[PDB]
Design a protein around this ligand. Sequence first.
Ligand code: NAD
Ligand code: NAD
Ligand code: FMN
Ligand code: FMN
Lengths: 326, 326
Amino acid sequence: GVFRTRFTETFGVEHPIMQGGMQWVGRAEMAAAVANAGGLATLSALTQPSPEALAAEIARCRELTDRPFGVNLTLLPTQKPVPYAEYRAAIIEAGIRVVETAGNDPGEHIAEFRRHGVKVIHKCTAVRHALKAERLGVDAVSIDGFECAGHPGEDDIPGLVLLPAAANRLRVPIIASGGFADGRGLVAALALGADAINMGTRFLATRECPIHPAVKAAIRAADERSTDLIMRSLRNTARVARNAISQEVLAIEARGGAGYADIAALVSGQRGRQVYQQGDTDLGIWSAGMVQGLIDDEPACAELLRDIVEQARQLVRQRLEGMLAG
Amino acid sequence: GVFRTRFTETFGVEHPIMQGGMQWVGRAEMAAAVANAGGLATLSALTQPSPEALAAEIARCRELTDRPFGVNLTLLPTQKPVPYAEYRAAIIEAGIRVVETAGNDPGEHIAEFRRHGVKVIHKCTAVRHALKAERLGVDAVSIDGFECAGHPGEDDIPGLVLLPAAANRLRVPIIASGGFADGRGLVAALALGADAINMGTRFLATRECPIHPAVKAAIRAADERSTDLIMRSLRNTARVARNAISQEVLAIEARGGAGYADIAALVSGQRGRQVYQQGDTDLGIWSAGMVQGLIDDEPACAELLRDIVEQARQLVRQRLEGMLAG
Ligand SMILES: NC(=O)c1ccc[n+]([C@@H]2O[C@H](COP(=O)([O-])OP(=O)(O)OC[C@H]3O[C@@H](n4cnc5c(N)ncnc54)[C@H](O)[C@@H]3O)[C@@H](O)[C@H]2O)c1
Ligand SMILES: NC(=O)c1ccc[n+]([C@@H]2O[C@H](COP(=O)([O-])OP(=O)(O)OC[C@H]3O[C@@H](n4cnc5c(N)ncnc54)[C@H](O)[C@@H]3O)[C@@H](O)[C@H]2O)c1
Ligand SMILES: Cc1cc2nc3c(=O)[nH]c(=O)nc-3n(C[C@H](O)[C@H](O)[C@H](O)COP(=O)(O)O)c2cc1C
Ligand SMILES: Cc1cc2nc3c(=O)[nH]c(=O)nc-3n(C[C@H](O)[C@H](O)[C@H](O)COP(=O)(O)O)c2cc1C
């Protein structure tokens, strides 16, 4: 493609751009659009309610794209127990060649994927977690900074510092994640030591993303200050779109004594998944990054990836080289 | 020099690198080293205890450098009243050609500096504040992200998002501030739309910085997780080196009911200035950015600035161009 990096080489895709795990959203239509657009796409595993349904969704995604795509397997605190090993079995038996893991204690799942020729990208929120993942033999790490939609951990280190700190210590390829939307972010991430960018919020605002048009309009209208950090008091911080629910969750936490039971009904994924289906952005918790303040359009995935790498190339060849010319 | 930008052109310095205001530290020896090294240096105005002392310090700095330097005038909540207009008078009558203002309601001081041919750089923490500063006629804005040592405001927007959001709206040159230490940060900031970087913590860890060697060793030893955000409960957030004092201030705020009187003795500048003088990093509050986790050396200012721009040039010409070659 336009940029050749350790990422494009390692994972065999045209652009140094990845669409990581997106609960509820990361379905066949999203993954295929990204894969057809030249990026590394992922189907969300836990968006499918059983291993058998994930097998069916992998098959459906293969009807929409001939290009390889990955699966994201997320290992975070769960309301109901999850049979991870069976999901893992389904991913392997389907011939998926790359997996993005995220969350706590990925060790046992990384090893099993390795034993079967499945490359692993592990997403994590601190240099010490990336190093531990590298010791476990992952093929790349995704470094999730404080900007990110979702779970940034509890250190509160933005990518401007976390990426070069990770690059000072890691040897496997690095994917920068959180806060990225355009070619300026891609060049910044490459300069800081990454080999690719991961994006979540930016793909919400694409034509093919299978969510309600009112969610996409909320992202365009939102600025960078319109997210909340919920569950800080439970040390399970999650960055979410500011709405009546997240503001209520914050009000409950500010009273003191709040435990997860006091907010479980507000933060439930079954309320949150209706946001994307019906477009009622106050129905529940939905994930959005502060990068929404850089987003006000709705391109097709193919034009978006092409625009990012072309804009990034022009930043190098015109803006940066122009400052070195005189 | 190596990089020519709107910043180097507007302010007539060789490198797109600025040393901004540093209370207690920003004295003649610091400013002259940076000015002699090719950067935009500043003397701290409120580090001098009277306008007359600031005049004497400007004169002392002119014995150490023949290059122009600026003065920083900070407008933040003060324990004792400050005669800003008289400090302003002293800066003007000394023939200072550039000033960095910071803090709340800079309007009246910006105008007076303008009336006398003094260019103004205003440091601020949000796009709406930078726009208001631009409407007041400043010559450049300094965009201080969440990474920064000092006062980041209350929006908690890191530079990876705040810089491109500012660049989407501002027309005057942009200086990126907070989280920068080396050539990777310079290139990232230029890619994101800035024309220069401002640094604070990085200059603490230089040979010429006139602080106790044990403070410089604490910065080298510290990682990116070793800062605290004090006074969040007072909406006067300040990022400081983690130490016994800052941890105590956090413990007082966590009890509830805390007002500034309950912590004024712990956060006083007269305890904090002894940190730099005696090197007892637990004597008081001292400012340090999370970028300390990228810093483990102690160069001369001249070699440091030269290394940053040379490293930045090699990132463009070798790393970035190499990814575009194939
Ligand atoms: N942006 C993101 O990273 C993101 C978004 C959606 C879901 N997820 C994760 O994918 C998985 C399945 O999605 P879901 O929405 O149906 O799960 P869920 O219905 O359990 O969502 C509840 C939220 O509270 C958290 N939680 C659950 N049990 C908890 C406990 N005992 N203590 C503290 N926090 C607890 C969950 O992590 C989740 O964020 C979850 O693990 C969820 O965390 C991640
Ligand atoms: N890294 C930085 O940005 C930085 C570092 C040092 C000082 N300063 C500022 O330079 C000026 C002079 O330095 P100083 O240390 O001698 O001042 P100081 O002795 O008053 O320091 C006390 C700290 O508490 C704050 N404060 C003071 N009065 C307050 C009030 N009524 N309510 C809430 N907060 C209050 C101050 O801003 C300061 O951060 C101050 O305005 C200070 O804020 C900024
Ligand atoms: C709606 C949505 C759902 C997400 N679901 C998951 C998930 O299930 N597991 C996970 O590891 N990350 C999840 N993420 C995080 C993304 O994979 C990615 O790390 C993050 O969006 C990067 O930050 P950005 O939004 O600024 O691009 C989700 C993000 C969004 C916006
Ligand atoms: C010791 C120290 C003192 C500072 N004093 C001031 C000050 O008086 N006024 C101000 O506007 N900024 C002050 N700053 C902030 C710097 O000017 C600069 O904005 C900040 O350090 C940028 O973040 P960085 O440390 O990551 O480079 C200070 C920073 C440090 C480290």
